[PDB]
Design a binder for this molecule. Sequence first.
Ligand SMILES: Cc1ncsc1CCO
Ligand SMILES: Cc1ncsc1CCO
Ligand SMILES: Cc1ncsc1CCO
Ligand SMILES: [Mg+2]
Ligand SMILES: [Mg+2]
Ligand SMILES: [Mg+2]
Lengths: 232, 235, 239
Amino acid sequence: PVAHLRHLLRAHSPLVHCMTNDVVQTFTANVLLAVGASPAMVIDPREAAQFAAIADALLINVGTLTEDRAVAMRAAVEHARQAGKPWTLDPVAVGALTVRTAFCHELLALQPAAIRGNASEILALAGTAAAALPAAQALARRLATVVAVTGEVDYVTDGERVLSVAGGNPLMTRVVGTGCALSAVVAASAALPGDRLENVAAACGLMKQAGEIAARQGGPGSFIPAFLDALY
Amino acid sequence: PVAHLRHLLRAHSPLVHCMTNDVVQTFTANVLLAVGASPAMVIDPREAAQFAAIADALLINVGTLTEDRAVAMRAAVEHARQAGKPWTLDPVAVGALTVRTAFCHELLALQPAAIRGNASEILALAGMTAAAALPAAQALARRLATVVAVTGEVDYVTDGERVLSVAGGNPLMTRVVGTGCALSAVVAASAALPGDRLENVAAACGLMKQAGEIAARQGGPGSFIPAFLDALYQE
Amino acid sequence: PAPVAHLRHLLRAHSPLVHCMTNDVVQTFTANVLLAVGASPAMVIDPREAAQFAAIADALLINVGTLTEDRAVAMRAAVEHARQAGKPWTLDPVAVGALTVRTAFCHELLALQPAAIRGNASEILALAGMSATAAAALPAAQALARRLATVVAVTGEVDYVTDGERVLSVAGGNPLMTRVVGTGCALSAVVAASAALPGDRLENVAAACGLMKQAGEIAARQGGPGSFIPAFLDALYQE
Ligand SMILES: Cc1ncsc1CCO
Ligand SMILES: Cc1ncsc1CCO
Ligand SMILES: Cc1ncsc1CCO
Ligand SMILES: [Mg+2]
Ligand SMILES: [Mg+2]
Ligand SMILES: [Mg+2]
């Protein structure tokens, strides 16, 4: 299942249009390259519209949102949707920051294939993980989307079924962008064949499995190269 | 006192609003996470004004300054000040590039809790090697009621009168981008912690040099980085 | 191989100050590579600051990997002030041919006389305006070099470098280099540095390609893309 997703990512080499935050660009691109996918960060509004039609999948991560970037993200989402390409939302700090929250609420109309966030963010988007489970189900139902609430245990739901994924290591939280990079791999996984819910759960399992390996060294510095090595 | 600062960073886990440059974002966030703090990069002018009142501390680093970002940074600083949250200035290349030099002069009016810079930067800001910039650092510290850290082979930290110096580190630290910029973020975090601000800032300097001495044992700047982050992390 | 070893010492000796206007994905790595080789990176992006600094720096890099309109303005100001001050500037036309805005922008920049251009086969073909790994674009390269009096480097598993008449080839490296982001973008930076060194420009740009291939070959035996990065920077630093 994780093994299957791994083989699939390599065989399809999904081309992922990443519109993500300033802190995680490099790490996201290297995670995607390590699993055999192709990252591409295109942020000018016109280029983004052009490219989102071409890419296999689109990721929207609002971690360092600005108004200019929001314009280009909205154009990207519209062109992806028009072209039948699945897009993934990562609502970083929604619920904590007003503008972000308003923007993501507006993007929900545009029918993401998947939403990947923490409990607080999922709870905010819907209006501890366990507490977010009802909200995630409701979101998945309203939008016919797959919702992943990530944490020490990840929970993935299509609004009917719910899958839990345990493993990994707390050290992953002391490394920036592991969640942001998980969303990119989830975004890629949505362009792959199979049950979407199950592919998103496998993506969570893939990242946890790499993380458990990488965490063995014991430190967050050495974690990064080992994490990337484990993905490849 | 380095051991004490490490303990404090872990126990207080300060939330640090980082408005820093494009070259050192990731490293800054990983450094803060490694010492037990929580980074947050928020750059829209509205969100930044919102967030700067919530975070425990604010870092302003002008290394890749742009017009939009300057507006956002000023707003963040104004709201941090109004909320009582300490903000730190890192005046990267102030004195060499005009726009950011003027901008930083403006910002000094809003009373940073700390300023962390190299000798030339501190001289340009004061209106006057690290030790050569020491009378300027002291003048700047007195004028603003701030702590000034003039950094280099040896770091000097002053509140206007008291001068603490911090030796250690390794020249390899200068062949890795962002070690100085990451120091500013740890200094920023430390200004939010209990205790004497001067001693905490000197302690932040000691912490980063000790980690750097350890990481430099790996021989090269590539291996330096993982080792440096490992050395900052406990357990 | 000799000019590569030579370049390695010249970069360290001159410590060229490179003004880097490059993409959001490769900032850190570009800076660290330039530091590892003994150069000095500087990322300056405000229009007024970039104009000021482009006059001062030893060389300028323009990489359009994550182009925006605001940034293209600053990049133009930089290029113009670098040219006025006689500092060599280098073009990395990332994804030219695949995205229209940056293709038009880079065509606009060609008029401003870059000292070097470095791209892959498809980018160089599209930049030259020719249809139909790197060998295939060598005609386009040559053509482009002549028209502009530039040095063009077309990279791939084998790199070709030309001033329009002469052609130098460099092989080696390792395909793992492609599973790590920014290795091309970083090569561009070192090329940009190399254009500011004394000697034959063409030969120096080729040697830059060689330097990076050699380090990549050593870095690649740490058989994963994660371990590659520290090993690559260490390799560039060693000696
Ligand atoms: C630290 C940080 N600030 C905005 S985004 C981000 C990375 C986590 O998504
Ligand atoms: C290399 C560089 N250029 C602007 S900022 C920065 C990071 C070093 O402080
Ligand atoms: C992944 C990516 N997207 C725009 S630029 C860039 C850098 C490739 O090296
Ligand atoms: Mg999130
Ligand atoms: Mg500084
Ligand atoms: Mg290129």
